[PDB]
Symmetry: T
Amino acid sequence: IDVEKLLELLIKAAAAEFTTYYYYTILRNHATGLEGEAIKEIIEDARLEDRNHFEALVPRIYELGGELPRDIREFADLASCRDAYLPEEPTIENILKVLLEAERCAVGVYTEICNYTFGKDPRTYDLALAILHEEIEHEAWFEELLTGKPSGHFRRGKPGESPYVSKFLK
Amino acid sequence: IDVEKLLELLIKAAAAEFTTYYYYTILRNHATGLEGEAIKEIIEDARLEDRNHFEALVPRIYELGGELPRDIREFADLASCRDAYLPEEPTIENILKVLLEAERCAVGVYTEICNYTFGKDPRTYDLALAILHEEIEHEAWFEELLTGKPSGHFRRGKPGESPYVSKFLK
Amino acid sequence: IDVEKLLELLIKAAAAEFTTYYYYTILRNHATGLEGEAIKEIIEDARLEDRNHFEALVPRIYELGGELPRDIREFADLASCRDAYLPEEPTIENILKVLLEAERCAVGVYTEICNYTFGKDPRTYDLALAILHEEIEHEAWFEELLTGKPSGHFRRGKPGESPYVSKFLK
Amino acid sequence: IDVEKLLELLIKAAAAEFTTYYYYTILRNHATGLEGEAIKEIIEDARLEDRNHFEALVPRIYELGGELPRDIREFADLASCRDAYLPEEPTIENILKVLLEAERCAVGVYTEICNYTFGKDPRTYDLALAILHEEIEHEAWFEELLTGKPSGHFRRGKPGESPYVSKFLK
Amino acid sequence: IDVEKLLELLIKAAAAEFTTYYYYTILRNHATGLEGEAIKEIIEDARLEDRNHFEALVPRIYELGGELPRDIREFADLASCRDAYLPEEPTIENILKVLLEAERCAVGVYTEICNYTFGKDPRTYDLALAILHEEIEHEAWFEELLTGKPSGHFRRGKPGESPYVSKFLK
Amino acid sequence: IDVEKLLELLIKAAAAEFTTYYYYTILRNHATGLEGEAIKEIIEDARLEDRNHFEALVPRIYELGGELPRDIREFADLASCRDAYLPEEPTIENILKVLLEAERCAVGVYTEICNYTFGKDPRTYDLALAILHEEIEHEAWFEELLTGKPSGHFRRGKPGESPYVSKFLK
Amino acid sequence: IDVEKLLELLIKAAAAEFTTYYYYTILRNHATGLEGEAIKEIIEDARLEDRNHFEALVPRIYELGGELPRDIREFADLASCRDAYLPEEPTIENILKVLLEAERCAVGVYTEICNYTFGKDPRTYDLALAILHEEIEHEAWFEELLTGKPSGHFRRGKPGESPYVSKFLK
Amino acid sequence: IDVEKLLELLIKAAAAEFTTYYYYTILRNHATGLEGEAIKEIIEDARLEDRNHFEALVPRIYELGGELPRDIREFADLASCRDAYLPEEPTIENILKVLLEAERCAVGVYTEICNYTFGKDPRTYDLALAILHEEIEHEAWFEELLTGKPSGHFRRGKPGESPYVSKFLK
Amino acid sequence: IDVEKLLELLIKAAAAEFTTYYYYTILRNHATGLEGEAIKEIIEDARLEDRNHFEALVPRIYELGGELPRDIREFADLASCRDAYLPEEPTIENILKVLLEAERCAVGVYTEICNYTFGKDPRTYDLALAILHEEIEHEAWFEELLTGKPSGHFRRGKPGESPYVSKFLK
Amino acid sequence: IDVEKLLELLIKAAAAEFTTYYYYTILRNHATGLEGEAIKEIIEDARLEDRNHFEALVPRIYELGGELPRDIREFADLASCRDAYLPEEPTIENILKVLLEAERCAVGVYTEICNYTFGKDPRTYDLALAILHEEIEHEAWFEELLTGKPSGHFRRGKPGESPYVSKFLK
Amino acid sequence: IDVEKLLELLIKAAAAEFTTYYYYTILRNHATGLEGEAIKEIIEDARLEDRNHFEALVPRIYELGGELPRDIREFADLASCRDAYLPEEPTIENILKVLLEAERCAVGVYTEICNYTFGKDPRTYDLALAILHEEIEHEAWFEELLTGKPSGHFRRGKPGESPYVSKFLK
Amino acid sequence: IDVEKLLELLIKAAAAEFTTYYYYTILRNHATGLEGEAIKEIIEDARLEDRNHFEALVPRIYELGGELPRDIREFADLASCRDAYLPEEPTIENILKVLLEAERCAVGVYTEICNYTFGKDPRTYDLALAILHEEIEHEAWFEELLTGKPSGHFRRGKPGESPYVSKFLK
Ligand SMILES: [Fe+3]
Ligand SMILES: [Fe+3]
Ligand SMILES: [Fe+3]
Ligand SMILES: [Fe+3]
Ligand SMILES: [O]
Ligand SMILES: [O]
Ligand SMILES: [O]
Ligand SMILES: [O]
């Protein structure tokens, strides 16, 4: 592994997690009405776990000799995923579309990291796998709500419980 | 402060909390169907906290030299808010209207007490403020469900948790 | 079983529990002095459990096709027991007399329900039995304090612990 | 009591509980979309309690001299209730119909056991009563969701909490 | 019910529980060797629950107007079961025989009390039923160890957990 | 606000709390006999909370640039309240008189601090308000015991629980 | 140390603990009225700890090569202290006299064991010391209640907490 | 990876776990006598963890686009392992032989899934690895009991604790 | 109060909290060496509490009719405090200077909000007061470390414990 | 033992603990800067345990017929150790010297009590030993910090945990 | 006391505990089969407590001015007991013989330390006494299993619970 | 995989963990003074986790058919890493150098095992990975303290918490 290339992927992934934690706050607040009450805790589950994903990625970046960018504006510009902006018409189905594209991108970025660190950096692989477990579950929540495909997933007992990345958290 | 005038406000406020704890029991039970399952725990959250509000107001009444009325019928007639009766057509939106008017009146009565004890009775102000925190949150739950205005409030983890009046409880 | 006759008994029993929860609040507050400090937590134990008895009776009423009355004034008028009014002279022995009559009536009403649902409605029998366990223990607390007959009962570790009706509570 | 006749009733009841635990797994997973999210935890509550009912029935069968059948295929054929198959059109209301018939049959079988062991086998009566408490509550959940009749029941705090059969569990 | 006849049965039952708590202490200590290590916790489970049975029977005796005998020697003479004396040859199988006869007698005495208070004293019936649940489980433990008949019972998680008589304890 | 004048008030208030924690130790020990057993835990409740009041006041003194006096003898001389000395005849009613004057003085000193920091030092106001909540409750305990005036206050579950100043504690 | 002489002292001490656990049950139940409500939990504290003292003495008897007597009647006859019989007139002060003599004897017997195993059997000394800590505290509870001498002891948080003999318990 | 081939492997594996949860129930009940008491909790540990393995496999089947078979009879026929039938002579060693073959097959099937998803489906690999951790430990328990080969494994603190598949559970 | 002017202050305050949570992550990581190990948990305490301050401010913004800005870049530009950039020479004392200026500004912004909502918006005042409690404590930690002025403050037991804003959190 | 001479030693020891609890509060607050942050929790550990030592000594004084002095000024004058005054130059090494002399004196006074009650008053010996355990550990903390001699001791998990005197605390 | 002679005894005792923690690991793993499953947790109980004994002895060695040997080989050579080597024929009875001799030697060494520090070093005496409590219990476990002498000891609820040396642990 | 070659690696790795647990005990005790107080808990964190690594490696050795060596001297000679001897001049930086070389070697040995069991022994890979997670974190603690390179790692909440190898522990 070229460590610089892996450092870029991990920094971009952390930027994606950090901006997601802000943008899901707006998306949660606009999940109003009787329809939105059902999905509020699902958005809350994903948002707090995505904040935990930023908390697990940063220690690994500094173990590898990398650093967070000096300016937070530069951090936002580095996100591996497009901003989960609130839709021009914030209906429940339009918000769910935005959440689905945000979590499909997250599954893609952590699949990229796992495919790059497989058998070469076992710690980075295990961190990306732990997050990829939770990104896949986030994607299935929003896919079932939006499309109706049985995903077999239940709701978290507590928001931000993070069953897979907990061993990486303090 | 005229203590008699403040005792009247606190007794009428406690009567509002006590009758609400009965009338929300009826309202919870008629939140039936798929739509009502989402609001049942929100009604349960408010009803148990309103019961805690009665439990916190009564000790303050006796510290100030006041007493609860001898007869419970007289207590009911003294409620600062109109009875949250079940609507003639108990649809979910009609029930939500009743809950919204019940919590808007509760915000008004505790704003009246805070505006009256501000800088004169610091304990009575702090109790009324603690309840006013929860009444405002109750109103925002029902306003978001009925109208769809983003309120930013999440559901309680446990019903009757009462994060603001807990220090006044036993 | 005639369900209407059983619904009347259960509604009157719940009205008795609800008004007891209000009247024991007044009785607790007037158990003052050195004598009253000993019985305050005993009144508090009974009052909170009687509130739990109202919380367990209401779900059964709605399972049976019954409903709580629309107006809380009509609910109070339906109580199976006379109001536990504060005595004209609120001495400790006069308050204990009022508590004793309140809990002897409660044992009577739940014995009436058990004798009516024995072998016909096993759920209603089991609910009435669970409350009758606690009403009998409430009566023995006040009988020992007032008369001095050994009852063998200890004080609850926590008020409203409800060791018998807990399985019916949420 | 003819113990063989009671052993047949308990073995058929446990077969119903065991197959229900499998068939509710399929029903939970197809409760998709915005409507389904509301009932997923309700199906999850019933499925884990029905698994606890199998865990409590089996010890009693062996105390009475009975045994589970050697082959699991023979166990499935012995279920006291028709299989809760997924509907040909798995809409939310069609799934709710299947759940309603599954729990109405369970109330019937445990009423048959209680009516048979009343005053003759107190342990078998008490176990059947504890399960009948939970089957009645399961039926009222799905009856309220499908029809809108007020049932007065709240959601379990945790899935499979089993407030009534817990004393029979390990 | 003749209360005097029922008071005799409950006092004799409590005497059986109290002496069992002492005699099982001796039996536990002589369950030595590799064979006895397996049965030590099973004896300990039964002995601590039999102590809980004495703690639950005594309050009921005093509610009914009865009293424990003045002298503990008179209490021992009133035991409804023969003393679980240590065998002349304290082998594991001979000790198991003594434990089996002790628990078969206990099942008989509490079946006698249930058959006497069925539908006449609901509290006394419910207390005897709760103890009968645990005596039946105690008998099945020693029957499976001594004879090998499948009983379906698992060990208690903690000694003296008393899943059935806990609601009667303090 | 003149900070020196507020530092004097806070130092004198902390000296009152520190000496109270010693003098209530003596008062607790002389609450003997049957009458004194009821008030021992009430004295213990107040003494441990008064110790917590000293623990919350000292950090605020050092934030404002003040310091505790070098000598503990000088600290005692600065108490805002007269010493809660043991009465020459330590009867229960004489001890209660001493406790009542100690807590009436404490309400006065913290009402003085609140009246001085109202709208000018929000942190100092909030600390004095939190203690004033507990001083008022302490006064009501002893006023109810000594005079019999209904106060509406129940006993603390644990001594030194300090429901109002807990957020200021470590 | 003559082990036989020490085995006699420990067996007689355990017999005292066992009979005390029965006789304090009677004494607790007759601590009726308003006066007795204050001492009921104090008797309950001592009785459950004296039961723990029997639970800690028996293992030591078997480590030393001793055994409990075969017959429980022989065990009762070996008690180092006279039976704490209920007084002919069971007033609160007469019951307190019986409890005081019971605990003064217990302090004497464990001082005898400590004076005999000092510097020779460190385990037997440490067990007797742990019980002597609790017997001294039991004596001071009843001495303060009966005579009014300040003893400085507070009530246990939970009955039978046994702060000193806990390490010897299972 | 061909998803259809992987879906077949996971469905057959889930069928093995589900039937094992039933067949180990029979095997547990026939582990009687003094020898069987030692292995009862070991069978109980494996059976409850095998139930957890079914609960973890099903969500993955639905994420991958697969579904459980409509009929439970068809699910039983799909088990990747032969049924753990009770032996014709249910001795402890014959039962242990059945348990050993059941867990050796389970190690084989999850090794097959890991060898198929290695570096291609990281989530499916991680789920199969977590179960393979527990199947290997199950096999070592029964191998040590039957043959005596040192395996180094200790008993679970609680049945069904599932240290490796917990993150996949709800 | 002009609500728009108060919404601007609360949005700018929340932007300060959000950017602080990122910038303190960088500052924590460069608190290296032996000197920095002492301050790492102090920076961690402040950073997690500042994240809680953002979580408490956002719900209030939406109750008042305000919203978070659509773009996170716009949110960063609105921070009421200059960015806590890492110093060009990241020595411990240079880092402490940056932390001190960050928390002195935070005390100023929340003192501005309290001075604006004093007696007009009791909920907004109480939220700003709760944060001002923690900002003052954060400032005192860094002032004591950098300058040596006695502050009287101890370390948090757990990072992000937030003793003052906890009631505003979920 | 002359009880008066032992009462003097115990009263002087309690006065030392009480004044230490005040003087360590000042010493804690002046342990500022980067050097002082390391020793703040060590001073906090010792100060809260010394307060626990005062809480364990006082009950023993009243069991022995002694009493605390009427005036707190007289209590301070009786301290067995010189006041732990803040040094004229409050450097970290000068403060550590003051703490070392305070804890060397405490080890001396409790060694004096143990040498006086050895084999004569086992309860007083055990209390003094329990405190002497903690005083020795306090001395080793400050000796290692000041001089660098390996003491082998670790920091308390929680301040005032008091592992040795906890059995004497309520 | 000659501190050098006592330091040698404690270092040799710690060496015995450290090597025991390794040798019991081998002994645990060879306690295979049906017989060995009963004794596995008993060996595990002793081994984890012997590890705790090493953790408690080392701090005392450094308080007294002693140090652990530089090389671990030198530490092994200093063990006060012969190595608990696995028997040439690792049968259960041969393993039990090794465990019995290991714990008889440990009782001897701590009896030697207690007999040497009796009345001269109270902390060293109390530490050795706490370990001697557990060594005596360890010896009784293996003596009862090997010989069948009633020892009266029950199994630890959790391995390494260490009821007697816990106060010396961190 | 050649199992013998992997058994050698795991035995040498466990020998390294066992000796590290002893040598870090000496290193902890010599981390004296003000500088060493900061690193004492860091050494304690690593030492207790390295002890857990020995506890997780040993079961795997016995599953694979390997055994611990008979003699502990032979175990020490097999350590994969040189002994972490105390430096001739035990300064803080010299001790940190010894800790850094100890943990760099540990990262190397577990990287060797992971590189050898990748895709061939999934259980051995997962155990080595779990330890490698903690060895990497241990190395970064000592690298940041000695050199000052930002590592991003925080201190453990509790010593020996072992977030990664916990699932392999009992
Ligand atoms: Fe357990
Ligand atoms: Fe366990
Ligand atoms: Fe346990
Ligand atoms: Fe255990
Ligand atoms: O366990
Ligand atoms: O467990
Ligand atoms: O246990
Ligand atoms: O345990």
